[PDB]
Design a protein around this ligand. Sequence first.
Ligand SMILES: [Ca+2]
Length: 131
Amino acid sequence: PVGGTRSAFSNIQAEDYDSSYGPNLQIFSLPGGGSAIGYIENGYSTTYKNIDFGDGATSVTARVATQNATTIQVRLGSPSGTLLGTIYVGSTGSFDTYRDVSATISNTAGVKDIVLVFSGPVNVDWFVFSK
Ligand SMILES: [Ca+2]
């Protein structure tokens, strides 16, 4: 990726946010190594600046755990910026059972700030984009 930037196409660790909304939000260690964000509620959000999408990505994948169906919006710039897509996360049976969940996104290219907006409790280990 371009200087000063993180690739869209390697895992973005969800705990590596530059900015966030949500008083309770926390990073939890995972039993086998690694970390995930959690204590997430409706209206919470994390922002990841300077993602390099190169000449285009059309899909997103997140490694997530939850006990109830919820969504993660993927937006540009801020929580009110352009909606690229929505990940529909079904229950995985536990906050420590992670599954990879994907969604398509509007074709996005070049360097962008990415915002994840949450509609309910979910844990997020990482997310990544594909062409
Ligand atoms: Ca992680």
